[PDB]
């Protein structure tokens, strides 16, 4: 059951306004006390869902952006910096530009998601909060 056995290690960054997620180069990697400085590099992937609004019409919910370490997750094959709609790249300066084979993704049957936190002083676009 591959799709049910794989997930982001972190909770989502919810996009509350019209601005897409983006970070200054050097910022944006979630805090994880189980990782080392070498490991601090990956991407956020956008997910959007649709549900029936209170007036009968389908409507989009706010988009959710999920973080995956480089070389893991739904875009495991993408190199750092590859251009793709709904994918934005983050790295702490000095991180290893190598797939994070020792981290992988999360299995919900084994671990709950880590509440996504960012270092104090991180710049977030309007409509993003952490």
């Amino acid at each position, epitope marked *: 059951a591959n799709m049910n056995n794989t997930a982001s290690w972190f909770t989502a960054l919810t996009q509350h306004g019209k601005e897409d997620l983006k970070f200054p180069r050097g910022q944006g990697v979630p805090i994880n006390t189980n990782s080392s400085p070498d490991d601090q*590099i990956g991407y956020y992937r956008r997910a959007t869902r649709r549900i029936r609004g209170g007036d009968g019409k389908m409507k989009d919910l706010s988009p959710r952006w999920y973080f995956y370490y480089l070389g893991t997750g739904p875009e495991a094959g993408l190199p750092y910096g590859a251009n793709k709609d709904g994918i934005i790249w983050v790295a702490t*300066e000095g991180a290893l*530009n190598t797939p994070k084979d020792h981290i992988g993704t999360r299995n919900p049957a084994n671990n709950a998601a880590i509440v996504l936190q960012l270092p104090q002083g991180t710049t977030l676009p309007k409509g993003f909060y952490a």
Partner: antibody
Amino acid sequence: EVQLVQSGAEVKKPGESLRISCKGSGYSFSSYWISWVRQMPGKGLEWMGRIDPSDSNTNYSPSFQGHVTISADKSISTAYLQWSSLKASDTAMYYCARLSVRVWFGELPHYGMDVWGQGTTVTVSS
Amino acid sequence: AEIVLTQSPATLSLSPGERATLSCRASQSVSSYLAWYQQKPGQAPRLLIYDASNRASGIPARFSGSGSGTDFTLTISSLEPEDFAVYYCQQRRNWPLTFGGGTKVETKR
């Protein structure tokens, strides 16, 4: 200019130990790995192993594990390759190369072996 | 060992002015972690292309690389006399780092 300068040609006999060296200049030595590569006469390139000078973490090719030791003195930007017992079959050209792997913002990193030393020949014969 | 890189053909025989296409195939996927090197006679290897498709600084525009996964190509759009050399690929996807066996580009007659 970024450069790696290797030590001079060596002529040795079987069983002797040997250490050759590789000196970096014009860059932060600890911010990049060092890789060692062997080329037998007339033959192709073969990876021997690498060292991260920041914490001296090493890895070796399975073919060279236990026959050579890679080390580094980061305070003088020098990497080393050392044999405990040379064999006639170690007669070859040895290259060190900067192995760029980290994301640095002040330049466009050329991920891979982006700067090479000029090579050191080792001749092993009784 | 582990990820095996196979270069084709072993020798390419061409004349200056002609297009060269060099092949590298990996025994399992290396995503984009593949580099190309040139080694001229009597000289150290030189990086040409890093992570499959990026041209190194100082490298002439006639060199280009493409591919992902297991199939990679180095193209020399129009050969110059100084491009007759040996070309090696190398993957950095996983330990141990491995080289292909080399393709020699030599002069046809």
